[PDB]
């Protein structure tokens, strides 16, 4: 079989075949000649230029290419043009298997409209509210009391969240109807309002579904997709805390009942919104192969890929709802190349200087091997880290530990945000909401700080590392074994903390306050000039990272955050006070081209916003295109140098004001 995706899922598929003993083929674009899925595959064929359209999206190339492998079936994947009719039609022109759902169900359910029809076909507890215009305030109050809901005032013709106000009491109902009619009459030319059961605070619970072309339909355990930034989810978890069998059993039964309704074959997944009063709302249903199943597979072992490919041959499944159980729970997170602390700045075109994944009792699905890069015209996802567990505390701690052991170098990421979110006591309380993120991050993003004991431990580990790397340079036995260091982070030596060290063995020290002070005998295990640093005092265990140094300042990472600790002796400490600290030039002015050349491409527009790290234009000289970018600034005021202006000579190409 041949896949249709070029991400982690492709690798997953070419991995499921291992046990299924199925030879696999994987196509690629020109830029992806070095992707892992190309070498993992048994066969590879090029699909032209790497721009999205020609790459994979070029059905004609793809369907035509499906004539040499011999494979009797070809996976549709989950992205790009997966589950598409124009594609399903073409594949049934050449009479080949789709390894996916049937057309009629797909167009009946994935369609934007008429989904409410199928929803109300059997009702299935669809959105509740007075179905019609509320012409009077009396009707609005009466229908609000009917269910005593937060009103969910929404315009009949309005969409996207415009014309919506949340009413909690009758006076609020009247005032918000008065505002809503005024807003909607001006904005959408419709005064027709509707009132529905608004949700106190949503959790966005999701229910998984599987089926088959013969029978033995099964309901998979539900999942969580509460956390969501810009309508994109981050953290997922299958057995949500607010789970009662009274609801859940009916959820599975109703999902299976809806399944046969449209004769769905390859079930996508069911979407719900759940309030603390344990309701459910079947709508916004999915018909795509969601790849958040690893979590469910961790709590079940139900290999969705194997079962769906088995059903693609008109055979029933190998599992029934009778044996499906729960053996704990799993947590999954997504690693993006999106720089959060810097206003969510995108960082692309950077191959991995060097990276190593966490592999301690955890699972990681990724398509980015060492020496791989991310283009702008693709998904900036790095890895899909998922860890098995049985208890919240157990599963989370694992994630905590596994986050710190993920070495990524060569480009930014959002691991700090994931770490801070997981460590927050609100997240460990047990329950969350969908507005959780912006509720806990009002102004931008700011990572939480360190407690006193954590900073002390970081100091101790830094001193141990300094001594260990110092002993390497000495010759033969003429080496020291004890010092007294003065650690102080910050440019002003904030909190000078005297530290000792003794190095009793290769990976054991006798850290103390100073000489003639009680000693603790911690342990540090670190390979010289490497990232990972495992330190264990008593029971507590920590993992820190070592970035680099200039022999007075150490670049060490603590809880997914970079710091610069200063490790200096008595003389250096007493002398660093008497050192000039000059301030570098802070110039917000025009930028000039360093060398002569020709401008062939421009990226930014005249007199608009500019952010740090953004490419601006590209000169070509002596057969070579450079690319001077914007180091750092907010905006510009200038006149653009036009295309093909072979002038340069250190002119003012862009002027920053």
């Amino acid at each position: 079989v041949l896949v249709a995706n070029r991400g982690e899922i492709a690798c997953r598929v070419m991995a499921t075949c291992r046990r299924l003993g199925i030879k696999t083929v994987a196509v690629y674009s020109t830029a992806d000649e070095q992707a892992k899925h190309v070498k993992v595959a048994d066969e590879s064929v090029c699909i032209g230029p790497p721009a999205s359209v020609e790459s994979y999206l070029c059905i004609d190339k793809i369907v035509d290419a499906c004539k040499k492998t011999g494979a009797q079936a070809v996976h549709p994947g989950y992205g790009f043009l997966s589950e598409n009719g124009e594609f399903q039609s073409a594949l049934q022109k050449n009479n080949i298997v789709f390894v996916g759902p049937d057309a009629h169900s797909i167009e009946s359910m994935g369609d934007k409209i008429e989904s409410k029809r199928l929803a109300q076909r059997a009702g299935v507890t669809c959105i509740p509210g007075f179905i019609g215009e509320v012409k009077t305030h009396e009707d609005l109050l009466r229908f609000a009391r009917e269910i005593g809901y937060p009103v969910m005032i929404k315009a009949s013709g309005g969409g996207g969240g415009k014309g919506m106000r949340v009413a909690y009491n009758d006076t609020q109902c009247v005032e918000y109807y008065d505002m809503c009619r005024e807003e909607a009459k001006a904005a959408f030319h419709s005064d027709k309002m509707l009132v529905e059961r608004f949700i106190d605070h949503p959790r966005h619970i999701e229910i998984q579904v599987i089926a088959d072309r013969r029978g033995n339909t099964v309901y998979l355990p539900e999942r969580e997709c509460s956390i969501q930034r810009r309508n994109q989810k981050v953290i997922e978890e299958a057995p949500s805390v607010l789970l009662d069998a009274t609801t859940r059993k009916a959820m599975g039964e109703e999902a299976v009942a809806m399944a046969r309704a449209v004769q769905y074959v390859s079930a996508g997944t069911v979407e719900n919104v759940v309030n603390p009063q344990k309701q459910f709302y079947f709508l916004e249903m999915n018909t795509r192969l969601q790849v958040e199943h690893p979590i469910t597979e961790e709590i079940t072992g139900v290999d969705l890929v194997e079962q769906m490919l088995r059903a693609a041959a008109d055979l029933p499944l190998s599992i029934t709802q009778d044996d499906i159980t729960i053996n704990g729970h799993a947590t999954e997170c997504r690693v993006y190349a999106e720089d959060p602390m810097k206003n969510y700045f995108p960082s692309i075109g950077r191959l991995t200087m060097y990276q190593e994944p966490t592999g301690a009792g955890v699972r990681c699905d990724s398509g980015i091997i060492e020496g791989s890069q991310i283009s702008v015209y693709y998904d900036p996802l790095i890895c899909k880290l998922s860890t098995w567990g049985r208890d919240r505390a157990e599963c989370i701690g694992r994630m905590e530990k596994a986050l710190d052991e993920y070495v990524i170098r060569g480009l930014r990421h959002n691991i700090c945000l994931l770490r801070d979110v997981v460590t927050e006591p609100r997240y460990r309380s047990g329950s969350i909401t969908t507005n959780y993120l912006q509720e806990q991050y009002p102004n931008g993003f700011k990572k939480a700080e360190l407690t006193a004991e954590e900073m002390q431990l970081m100091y101790e580990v830094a001193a141990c590392v300094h001594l260990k790397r110092e002993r390497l340079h000495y010759t033969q036995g003429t080496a020291p074994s004890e010092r007294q260091l003065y650690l102080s982070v910050g440019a002003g030596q904030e909190g000078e903390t005297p530290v000792y060290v003794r190095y009793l063995d290769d990976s054991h020290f006798e850290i103390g306050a100073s000489k003639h002070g009680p000693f603790r005998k911690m342990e540090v295990v670190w390979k010289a000039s490497y990232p990972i640093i495992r330190v264990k005092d008593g029971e507590a265990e920590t993992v820190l990272q070592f970035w680099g140094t200039n022999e007075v300042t150490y670049g060490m990472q603590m809880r997914g955050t970079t710091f610069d600790v200063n490790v200096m002796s008595d003389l250096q400490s007493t002398l660093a006070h008497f050192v000039p600290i000059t301030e570098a030039t802070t110039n917000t002015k025009q930028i000039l081209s360093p060398m002569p050349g020709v401008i062939v491409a421009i990226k930014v527009q005249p007199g608009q916003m500019v952010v740090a790290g953004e490419e601006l234009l590209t000169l070509e000289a002596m057969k070579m295109r450079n690319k001077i970018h914007a180091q750092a600034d907010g905006k510009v005021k200038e006149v653009k140098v036009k295309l093909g202006a072979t002038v340069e000579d250190n002119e003012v190409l862009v002027e920053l004001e």
Partner: protein
């Protein structure tokens, strides 16, 4: 007790003794001479004698290995040299010539001492002669912590490496007063000879540091690389890194387009051991990189082009930089590893008006005269005389390697097509340039001739380099008998 140094520190500056204490080991400095006077007897100098006479000379010890050093003192007479100051320095250099030990000096002198007359010139001449004679015998490093003017500037110049401190140091031959007197332009001391000027414009300073503390901390690290003398072998340090570490990221560094640029450091860093690069002259002639690095625990010399800056084109400044680095590396038996990516020489009238012919020959002379083991890797391209200059196999090179997408040709395809068909029918571009580039802009022809040993996968570079550098440990080559060469100055 912190007497007499409060006046110094109040100006945000350190003292000579404090610098010496910071450089060496905690308790291994033994000051040599401390009670010496100037015995001048002129211009009312018979009084105000000083015990130290403005110099601190000792022995010290760094990383368990011996050293010699001296430091000027700015408080006493402004650091001026004399018939008596220079005697201590001469004695130290002579002793460090008998024993195979290097010398490091921290310059702070304000100029010559006028009250001694021509005795200051005598001392300067003696120091110059010692530097000239002992260059190439023991490594010499110089750091400039404060003002350095007059004719005293020449002795740091002859030394192998000169470093500078950022805020409070400068160096030049003639003061701005004379410049105003003759030309009439008002230029400040920093605008004339500041650390930035010598870092970027003149190319004299080999580096710049932000503070004295950082200067000492990194000077120790630099000292950890050098061999002790001319006859001593290259130092080898223990290291947990191993030649079997996987480097497969090199397969993707070179883009598939011939007009796109990349950073050569992405090729340099994987091959060498982790966090073991010490760049030399980082802000001058950025199209070429030179420095020191370790390969399997032994120090080597690195010289590579960079297509990031000016398409990696050789030039005057790059030629001088590479020539000096190669000469120093060969003088002390240090292996050389080079990475080649050059389209040719920089074209322009200013270049010929500035003597490209002289300067470009220096790098070729340095590469041909060298007798240390050499390893060369051609990543993408090498054209014209630039291929010859950058350690080609014909210049007694030990082992040469190429990557599968390399190109070695006489010149670009356009010029060859033009010269090979004078008045051939128009549109000849499309069906001739492509064919010529396909047939002869590839390493197959150069491999057929025997100019590259083998064509290797980019993932095997570390393995090959470690193997070759281990095997070549005991090469013995000698040049014909000469009093000395005649390099094109």
């Amino acid at each position: 007790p912190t007497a007499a140094e409060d006046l110094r520190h109040k100006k945000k500056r350190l003292t000579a003794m404090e610098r010496v204490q910071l450089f060496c080991d905690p308790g291994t400095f033994r000051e040599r001479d401390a009670l010496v006077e100037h015995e001048c007897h002129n211009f009312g100098m018979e009084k105000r004698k000083v015990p130290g006479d403005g110099f601190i000379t000792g022995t010290g010890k760094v990383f368990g290995r011996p050293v010699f050093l001296f430091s000027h003192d700015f408080t006493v007479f402004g650091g001026s040299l004399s018939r008596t100051n220079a005697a201590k320095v001469v004695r130290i250099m002579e002793e460090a010539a008998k024993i195979g030990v290097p010398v490091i000096g921290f310059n702070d002198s304000g100029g010559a001492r006028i009250h001694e007359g021509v005795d200051s010139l005598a001392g300067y001449a003696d120091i110059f002669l010692r530097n000239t004679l002992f260059s190439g015998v023991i490594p010499q490093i110089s750091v400039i912590m404060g003002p350095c003017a007059g004719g005293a500037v020449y002795s740091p110049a002859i030394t192998d490496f000169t470093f500078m401190v950022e805020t409070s140091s400068y160096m030049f031959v003639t003061g701005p007063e004379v410049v105003s007197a003759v030309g009439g332009k008002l230029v400040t001391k920093d605008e004339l000879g500041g650390p930035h000027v010598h870092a970027t414009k003149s190319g004299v300073s080999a580096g710049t540091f932000p503070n004295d503390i950082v200067a000492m901390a990194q000077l120790r690290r630099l000292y950890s690389y050098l061999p002790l003398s001319n006859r001593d072998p290259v130092p080898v340090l223990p290291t947990a890194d191993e030649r079997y570490r996987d480097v497969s990221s090199l397969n993707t560094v070179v883009p598939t387009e011939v007009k796109e640029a990349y950073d050569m450091r992405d090729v340099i860093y994987p091959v060498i051991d982790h966090d073991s690069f010490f760049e030399i002259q980082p802000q001058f002639a950025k199209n070429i990189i030179c420095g020191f690095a370790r390969v399997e625990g032994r120090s080597v010399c690195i010289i590579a082009n960079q297509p990031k800056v000016q398409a990696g084109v050789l030039d005057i400044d790059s030629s001088v930089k590479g020539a000096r680095m190669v000469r120093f590396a060969d003088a002390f038996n240090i292996p050389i590893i080079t990475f080649v990516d050059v389209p040719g020489f920089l074209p322009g009238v200013q270049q010929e008006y500035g003597g490209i012919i002289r300067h470009g020959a220096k790098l070729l002379y340095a590469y041909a005269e060298a007798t240390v083991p050499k390893v060369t890797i051609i990543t993408r391209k090498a054209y014209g005389g630039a291929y010859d200059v950058m350690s080609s196999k014909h210049l007694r090179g030990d082992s040469n390697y190429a990557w599968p997408h390399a190109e070695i040709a006489v010149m670009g395809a356009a010029g060859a097509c033009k010269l090979l068909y004078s008045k051939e029918t128009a549109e000849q571009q499309a069906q001739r340039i492509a064919d010529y580039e396909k047939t002869f802009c590839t390493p197959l022809s150069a491999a057929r001739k025997g100019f590259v040993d083998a064509v290797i996968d980019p993932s095997e570079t570390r393995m090959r380099v470690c193997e070759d550098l281990e095997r070549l440990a005991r090469k013995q080559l000698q040049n014909p008998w000469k009093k000395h060469g005649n390099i094109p100055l």
